Every structure is written in structure tokens, then in C-alpha cells.
Amino acid sequence: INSREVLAEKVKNAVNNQPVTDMHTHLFSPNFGEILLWDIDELLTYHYLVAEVMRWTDVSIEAFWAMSKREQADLIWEELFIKRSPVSEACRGVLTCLQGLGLDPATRDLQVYREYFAKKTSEEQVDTVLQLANVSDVVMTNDPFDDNERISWLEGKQPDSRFHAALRLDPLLNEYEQTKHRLRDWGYKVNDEWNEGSIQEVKRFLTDWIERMDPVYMAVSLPPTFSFPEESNRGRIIRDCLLPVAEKHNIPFAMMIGVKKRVHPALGDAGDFVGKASMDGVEHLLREYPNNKFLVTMLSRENQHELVVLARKFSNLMIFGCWWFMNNPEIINEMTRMRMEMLGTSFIPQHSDARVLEQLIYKWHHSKSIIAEVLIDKYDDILQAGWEVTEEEIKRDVADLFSRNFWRFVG
Amino acid sequence: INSREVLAEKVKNAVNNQPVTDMHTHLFSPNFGEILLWDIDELLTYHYLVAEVMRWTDVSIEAFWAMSKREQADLIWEELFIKRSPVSEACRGVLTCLQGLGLDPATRDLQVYREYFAKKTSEEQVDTVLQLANVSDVVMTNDPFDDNERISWLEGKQPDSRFHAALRLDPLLNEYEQTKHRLRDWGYKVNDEWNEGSIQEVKRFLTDWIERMDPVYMAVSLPPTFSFPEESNRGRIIRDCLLPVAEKHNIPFAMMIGVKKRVHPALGDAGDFVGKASMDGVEHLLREYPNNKFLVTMLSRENQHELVVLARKFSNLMIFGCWWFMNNPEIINEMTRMRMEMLGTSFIPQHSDARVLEQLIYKWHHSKSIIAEVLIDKYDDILQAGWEVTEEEIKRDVADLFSRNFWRFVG
Amino acid sequence: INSREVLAEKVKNAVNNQPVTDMHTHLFSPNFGEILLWDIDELLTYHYLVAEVMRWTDVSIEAFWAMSKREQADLIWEELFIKRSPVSEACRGVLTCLQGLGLDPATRDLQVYREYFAKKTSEEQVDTVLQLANVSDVVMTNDPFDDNERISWLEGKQPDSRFHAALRLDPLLNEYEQTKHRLRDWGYKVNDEWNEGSIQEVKRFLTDWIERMDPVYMAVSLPPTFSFPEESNRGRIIRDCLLPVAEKHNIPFAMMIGVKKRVHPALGDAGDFVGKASMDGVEHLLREYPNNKFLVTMLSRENQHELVVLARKFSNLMIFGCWWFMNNPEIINEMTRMRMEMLGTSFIPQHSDARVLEQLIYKWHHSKSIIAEVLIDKYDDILQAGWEVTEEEIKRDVADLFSRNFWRFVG
Numbered sequence A, B, C: 001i002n003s004r005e006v007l008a009e010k011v012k013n014a015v016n017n018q019p020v021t022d023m024h025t026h027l028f029s030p031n032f033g034e035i036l037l038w039d040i041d042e043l044l045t046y047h048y049l050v051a052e053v054m055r056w057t058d059v060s061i062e063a064f065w066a067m068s069k070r071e072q073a074d075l076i077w078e079e080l081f082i083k084r085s086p087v088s089e090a091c092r093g094v095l096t097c098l099q100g101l102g103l104d105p106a107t108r109d110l111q112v113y114r115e116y117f118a119k120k121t122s123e124e125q126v127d128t129v130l131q132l133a134n135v136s137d138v139v140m141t142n143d144p145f146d147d148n149e150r151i152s153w154l155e156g157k158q159p160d161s162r163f164h165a166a167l168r169l170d171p172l173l174n175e176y177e178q179t180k181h182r183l184r185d186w187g188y189k190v191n192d193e194w195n196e197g198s199i200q201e202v203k204r205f206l207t208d209w210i211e212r213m214d215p216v217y218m219a220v221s222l223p224p225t226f227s228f229p230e231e232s233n234r235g236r237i238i239r240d241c242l243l244p245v246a247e248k249h250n251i252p253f254a255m256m257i258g259v260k261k262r263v264h265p266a267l268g269d270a271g272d273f274v275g276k277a278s279m280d281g282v283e284h285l286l287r288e289y290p291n292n293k294f295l296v297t298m299l300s301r302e303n304q305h306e307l308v309v310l311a312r313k314f315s316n317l318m319i320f321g322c323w324w325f326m327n328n329p330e331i332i333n334e335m336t337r338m339r340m341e342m343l344g345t346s347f348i349p350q351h352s353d354a355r356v357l358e359q360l361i362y363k364w365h366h367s368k369s370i371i372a373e374v375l376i377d378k379y380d381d382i383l384q385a386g387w388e389v390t391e392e393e394i395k396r397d398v399a400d401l402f403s404r405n406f407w408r409f410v411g
């Protein structure tokens, strides 16, 4: 390669053809049941769009939740696509999905699009989507406190080889005072106070599930006020239970910091907000637990640059994705550029956070084009400096970014 | 449209031809008197340039204020345009105004530029400028605590139909301790305590001025430390008087948060600074007062992204403009993109904040070019996804952004 | 200048031809000895690359520090250049230096690059590098608390006309409890108690060193928690000694704010982190000490915009460079644009912070190209407004930005 033009095609092709390992989604293996969502109506009722439609429609939130799935979908399509152009990232995403499946957004024929999905099955749509989105591996969010999901694990169900488990623990860490009673009901003899017994039982709880799911990592989403150390249930659990168990099983600990839950409870999953967090807690964890691995992603735009700098300090920290409110072109671009400039290729640029199966298509299509453009710029800079990049080196670097860095980290 | 080039021309045409409603300025109906500032000398002595010239000139701030308007204008012209290239946004803006008026910056003939304004009346210039800037409606900042402005309203003088009033309340909310003495002198018997009597009289004051002004909204500028609820005069006035009255008359409450007043007293209007604010008070107001409408713009760059996320949570929140220190190309661009990507077209991209008539020319010229660029990108992305946008839908979306969204919100 | 194409040509040439005054580096006049670091092995072992290589290599940090300079350099070359493409800014910089020296990165022949340096003397390489990077003046960081540097000064060493001293005081201001003992060891009779006697001896220490080094400014790097006034050694020493001495000798005070030292002790120089600081202390200093001059650069991305706004308020504030974690293309670009949009040309866009002689080549090459682009955009915008910029004015502006603004400020 010795031309930006030539470089551009080589990079775009390597990126496009590179099978993706999506290390954080809200999808489930087909055999887990209806817990796996898919089709155009599910795409249109994605909570991102529920929030956006409420800024326009005169239909009360109560009434909205009272409508059927199809009715909610019809309202959103009309309000966000017909009455106004679907220029938002979330709306754009729905279109990218339709087009990717072979459907044509030009006609705006929602009924015809729907007819497409009605024909196929879950296992069938999964194969097609994973093919079209070029995703080889999907990491789920497995929460044992969720009855709809725990039932499948207790039944001995196993996800197919393309889906990996990740032990989600928000209820345990953030709501211990209520959750402790559920552990007791499950036979985990935790006591009123934090003593040897409570510690051991919570650890047994973690180990039992690690044994059941064989998770690639344990995870938790945290508030902007997250601090560590801390004399709170969360602080003690992390210190006395999670970290020791994680080290023993060499399992990474994923922290998604910055979410302020339910600032608008009526909106349900669309009612969460964001706040800038202190880096002190993460800094402490990284330094004081050198034998533990940490995967981190933050919600606030204002935490992104310093998070990158922290990654420069600690190799036991792997930063990943452009999470939630960060998953917009303007932010993805600035984040990926800051990350590559200070970390080279030693990071995971993105995850889809897909809640609806088809999203894998747009999530990866929208991000890959931006990442490819960033790569082209960086490769070109060193080419201009006289360096010679081979297509094989490109495919290698791209492989690390979209798949290898993750598996290498989880080990 | 089926090509970026084609799209670009149709988008730019739609943006340029769309009549603008400037929902926040410091301009006054021409019949109000000299408070309506205009001409090249007023543009050159805009406080933005006073701050900039003071970074170069050897002239003391005292000596500067002692100079006549023409002398100050002369100094600023020589210091910021001749001794160094006028590359700053504020300086660039002055040139943009001259050009729009038919004058030629190439000559740098300040004397000739001045001759242009001397042969014109204020009403004439108003028609000229509003025409050039394609501004159909101007929202003023009317402060009933200023003796001069108070005259116009008490005399029953109505403003030009193109100008709308906005009840500014900074003295009341931020300086109650000193303002209460004037409220009493005006017939509003507020006590030195916050009893029912005082509460009722403040409401009466607001109610009376809403009747006299028929404002599109009530407004206040707040410091980075703004909090709510709060046991202070401002906190009690907002809770017990402003919100109740605003809800009863269904008029929005505009909050411009982030200004740290007079960090450099000697600079006058040019001595204000900025600070990041907590989103807690705004979040509280939105959630706890669903029957009230809120217009918000923040001064800190670091508050922009989270403000957008907050708008996603509450439909009774309408964010607007790129205020003051945010009114620069680099910031206008990132802000507008973040806003459209997460809010689609459900927001008001800009306002001029013009203190001098002519500024409407450059403020909107400089902002429309950027907004057009963003729209082109967003339209092209969905266009690439197979969606087809009609030129009529473009005019519709452009109308919402530059005018409809505001009037719709103020109801 | 007719077209943007013609404009770009004249701007690029002026920027490239303009001799640079690098107002902050960690280089020393060659006659000072081996403390002046140079050659490819030094470039490769720059702490920026030590941090980066530790994110990839299996070699422990202890084993790394135990390796020879050559072995460390071989490791870094293989890990960051061969096993992965050298796309990070720091790695790209190493290549740019190689190319600028006439070597060829295409061969990846590290053994051959090393031969180029095995010949030359320090004096020759200084002449070579300064000519290539077109740097006419280099400001050093002279720390009288470092035993080695101190001996040179006490024994009469003077830098040649191309190098200027800057009195660095971190140990005095940030570690006074440890430093007071050393002051006493040097004849400065400070008491354990902070009183008039101690104040006078610290003032005498500063005076003696100002006289010995004839520094262009006194400097210190500060933590994100920096505040002023403050009841602490730093607060008292700045108030009682530094500011009065600086005013008396009319010497500016350079504050580099935002570094959190040694968050990862084992990484040595590569173990410092970043944090956002309050602007309160800087605002206070500028306002209350109008007779003192302050040079400021901040480490947090989130402090940049407000720092610019503060410069608009105070002429005794000169902001400079894109420091450390800010010295990446994505950040340099946004910072430089915000600065010019709000300050025109009244600022110092960059400094190299070079710790290794050859870095001057890449630091200035990478920054000049970015600064050139910003200038082209800004000049083009006013050209489109009708203004006509001459090539002489362009050369003047470029001279101000890269050299004149500094000498003028510290004059």
C-alpha cells in the first residue's frame, strides 16, 4: 500500500470482513425463548425510540404503555419517521436494519416489512442476522435475579456455541439490603451483619453461578457516585467476595460506570440518566488489585479522555465500547480517535448493546464505518512517515480490535 | 433527492430561505428608543471585542472606558483588525455584517463604513437587517427592574409586531434582598420575611407584568452553583411564586445556566466567566413540575452532552441555542451533532443573543452554514440507508428547527 | 490571496518557515552534558512508550527496568512496531523523527538507525535537530533541587544562546516538609515554623536562583486539587514568597495544572495520571495579583474551554500549549480551534515538552500541520467575508503564535 486511496479500500474491506465478537449485548441464545427479541416491531419499540417519541407525541406515557406492541410501533413510525425525518441515530438504525435484510426503506411500507418477519423463526433469524452483521460471537447479559432467565439455567439449558454468558450482578451489589433475602430463600445463609458466614455464602453464590454459566466475565453497572473503597454493602461485597473469587477463577470484572437509574420512572427502561464519575475508585481497584482484571466503559462524555489515560497506567484495565449515550457518531469518533492516539490498538472500540436481534446489523455497520475511517487516518499518518503497512498487518490489527483483544483479555 | 450534491443544494436552499424566529436577543423594538443599538461603532464595541482588545492593547481599562464610542471603535479596529488578522469568531462576525450590508471589508475603510449608517434611521436599518438575516420574529429581553425599559411599558407603548417580549427576572430571583425595596416602592408590599403576604405580592408582580408584556416566556440567568430545591430567596421565589404562576398562564420558564458574573468587575459586561453546573436542580424541576414548561441553555461545554440526555428524559424540557462562550464554530458543530443524533429535530439549534442590530446578519449566517452541514450529513446517512427524503420534508424539518419548535413549545 | 488553495500554500509555507521558540521542554544546552538525552534508543524508551508497551508485553515491569537501554528499546520496537502497527501518536512520532533525519522507516532496520547516532557528538546532533525542526530557541526546565543539575549551575555552567532557563520549583511548593531540610543544608535558614524568618530565607533562595539562572519564568506543575488561597505550605509559599518576588523581578509564573503524580509508582515517569481542576484558584490569582504575569497550561481535556474563557477575562494570563495527554491530534485540533475562535491570535498554541532531543522533529511537525489547517480555515472564513489577508500579515500572525507572543509576554 502506497496511496491513501488504496489504503482506504484495504482498510474498509478488512474491517467489513472481520468477524465480530460482540462483548456486551442484551441478546440471548434462541433456545432461551421469548427472552430473545426480534423483528421490526421490536426494533421500533426499542426504549431509545420510546424516549424520542415522547418528545413529540401528545399520547400520554400511560396510554403508550396501554397500547399493544404493534400499536406502539405504529405510533413511533408515524411520529418519528413520517411526521419528521428519521435523522436521529436510533431512527437511522432502524432503516439500516431494514435495508440490510433486503427490505426497501424507500417505499416506507411498514406492513410489507412486518410480513417479512412473520414468516421466519427465531433460530432462523439468528442465523441470517449473524451472517449479515458478520458477528461470530455474542456475549449476553445473564442476570440470575431475573426469573424469566434463571428458569432456563436451572432447567440445565445451555446457549449454543455462538452465545457466551456474562454474570450480571447489579441486584446483588446495588440492592443487597433487598436482595440478601432472596439469597436466603435460595439457601445462601447470609446473616444480618457482614461476617465470615455472609462472606462465604455470597462467595458460594458467585461460585455456583460461575460453575453454571461459565461466564467470560462478571459485570455490574454503577452510578456516577461510585466510590471504592466504601463501607457499604457494595463496597464490602466487591472487596470480600467478588474480587477474591474473580482472581481465583481468573475472571475479569466489568464495570459500566455513570448511569443514574430511573430519573423518570414512568419511562421504564427509557428513564435512566447520566452523570460524570470520579476516577478514584477505578484507579484504586486497578492499583491495589494487580491480580484482578477489569473491563470498563463509562457513560459520561466527560469521563472518556481520563479513562483512556488511566488505561495508559494499568495493563490490568481494558476499556471497551462507546456505551449508550456515547453510542452516537459524534462521540464514537472523538472517543475512538483519543483511544487510538494514546493506546494504539490495545483497546476494544465497540460493542452493540443490542436488545433486539436485528440491531446487530446497524450497530456494527454504523460503528465499523467510523472505526475504518479512524484507522485509515492513522495508517496514512505513518505511511506518510515512510512506514510500510501490509494488508496482512491491517487484517491483524483489525482482528485485535474487533475480536482478539477481548478473548486475549478474558484469557 | 438521490445524491449528496443534490441534497446539499436543497438543504442549503431550505435553510437560507427559512424565516428565522430568534427566541433570545438583547434587541428592542425601534420605537423603544436608543436602547436599540446599531451601526459599525456599536458592533466594534460589543463587549466580546472589549475583552479581546484588552488582551493586546496597552491602553488601560480605565482609559478605554473614558474614550468616546468612536475612539473605542477606532482602537479595537486598529488592535484587532490591523495589527493582527481578525480571525476570531467575534471579529469575523463584524466583517460578515459589513459584507452583508453591501460594504466591502477588502477596503478596510472604516470611515466609509460609518457614512453608511449616518444616512439611515433605526426603523430603516431594522427592515434592512431583518431582511438580510431573513429573521421574521425577534424575542427581546425585557427587564422591568430597569428604569429606562420600565418607561416604555408603563407608557403603554407597544412594540413592533415583529418583536416579542420575554419577562427577564434576574434582579428578583438573584438579588431579592436589594430588589424587595423597589417592589415595595412599586406597590408590592413584600415583608422582610417569607410569609403568605410576601408570596402573594410577588405573584401579583409577576402576574401584572405578564399582563403588561404578554411575554412568550419568563427568564433568568443562573450561576454554575444553581441548585433546586433551595432554602434561599431564589429557591423560595421559584417554588412559591414563579412556577405556580407559570403553570397557571401556561408560559415557559427559560433558564440560562452557568454564568459566573463579574469575575473581572472593571470589564463590565465583558467581565463574566463560566462554570459547569450540576444537573440536579434542572432534573428535579423537570420531574416534579410536569405541568410547567422549561427552556434551557447552558454555558459550560461540559454540560452540553448531559443536557441532551436530560432532554431525552423529559418532554417538558426544550433545549435551545449555543449560548455565549458556546457560540463558536467548534462548539456549535459538536453541540448540534450531539443534539440531532439523540433528539432528531426535537430541539431549537440556535438563537443570536444579538445586542447590536446588525449582529443578526453574522450570527445567523455563521450558524446556518454549520446547521446546514449537519443536516446534509444526517440526511445523507438515512439516504444511504435507502430512505427517500422529499424537498418538502426538508423544508418542514428546517421550519421546525428555526421557528416552529419554539412557537409550538411556548404554545 | 484568491482561493483557499492559494491560501493553504502561503499559510503552510509561513508556518513551516517560521523559526520556533519552544517555551517548555526537558532538554538542556549540550554543554550541560549527558543530562541532554538523544538518539533512537532514547526515543524508543521515552516514558510514553514504556506505558504503551506495558499494555502488551509479558515482560514484568521489574524485568523491564532491569534491562539495558538497548534491550528495552528492542522490546518496545518489537511489541509496538512489529507485533502491532505503530499507529499511536507516540509511536508515529518515532517514525517521523527517523524520516526527518534521512533514515528510512520502510526498512524497519533498527540496527542501521542506531549507526546514524553512533557517529555524531551531542553538539552536532543539536545543530542537526534544531535546523530540521526549525527551532531557534529552547526553554529548559531547570530544577535546582536535582543534585546533578544543581552542581552544573553552582560550578558556573551557562547554556549557549539557543537555550533559556526556567526555574522549576515543584519540590519547594509541593514537598516543602521534605525540602525545608535541604534548604537548611544549603544555607537558607528556614525554621520548622513558618514565620517571617522562614519567609525571608525562602525569598532569598528564589532571588539567588533567579540571579544565577536568569530564567524566563518560574514554574511548577500542580495537582487537580490545586486551590488558592489555601492554608498549606504551597498556599503560604506562593502568597508570602513567590508572588512578591515574581512581581519585584517582573518574572512570570508558569502553572501546569492537573497532574496526579505516581498513581502507578512502578512505572516511574510513566506513572502520572490526570484530573480536572477547579478554575477558582487561577481566577483568584489573576484577579487579585494584577501586577503578576501567569503562564498556564492544563492537563484535563475538560478544563480546556473554560481556560480559554478565563484568558478572555484577564490579560495577565497567557495560555500555552497542548500539554502531555492533550498532545494528541484529536485534542490539539479542538483546543487550537476553541482558542483561536475566542482569542484570535492572543495565545501560544504549542510547546514540545521534548525529553529526548530528536522529539523536536515530530512534536513540531505533527503540531504545525494541525495549526496550519486551523489557520487556513480561519483565514478562509474571513476571506469569504470579503477581507483580504496579505502574505506579510500571515507571516506576522504565524510569528506571533510560534515565537513573538511568548517573548512579548515574558519580556
Ligand SMILES: O=CC(=O)[C@@H](O)[C@H](O)[C@H](O)C(=O)O
Residues within 6 Å of the ligand: A026, A141, A221, A256, A269, A323, A324, A353, A355
Ligand atoms: O444501550 C442502552 C442499554 O442497553 C441500557 O438500557 C442497559 O441498561 C445498559 O447497557 C446495561 O447493560 O446496564
Ligand SMILES: O=CC(=O)[C@@H](O)[C@H](O)[C@H](O)C(=O)O
Residues within 6 Å of the ligand: B026, B141, B221, B256, B269, B323, B324, B325, B353, B355
Ligand atoms: O452572548 C453574550 C450575552 O448576550 C451576555 O452578555 C448576556 O448577559 C446573557 O446572554 C444573558 O442574557 O444573561
Ligand SMILES: O=CC(=O)[C@@H](O)[C@H](O)[C@H](O)C(=O)O
Residues within 6 Å of the ligand: C026, C141, C221, C256, C269, C323, C324, C325, C353, C355
Ligand atoms: O509530556 C510529558 C512530560 O514531559 C511529563 O513527564 C512532565 O513531568 C511534565 O511535562 C512536567 O513538566 O511536569
Ligand SMILES: [Cl-]
Residues within 6 Å of the ligand: A276, A302, B276, B302, C276, C302
Ligand atoms: Cl467535566
Ligand SMILES: [Zn+2]
Residues within 6 Å of the ligand: A024, A025, A026, A141, A353
Ligand atoms: Zn447494556
Ligand SMILES: [Zn+2]
Residues within 6 Å of the ligand: B024, B025, B026, B141, B353
Ligand atoms: Zn442573552
Ligand SMILES: [Zn+2]
Residues within 6 Å of the ligand: A334, B334, C334
Ligand atoms: Zn470534535
Ligand SMILES: [Zn+2]
Residues within 6 Å of the ligand: C024, C025, C026, C353
Ligand atoms: Zn514538561
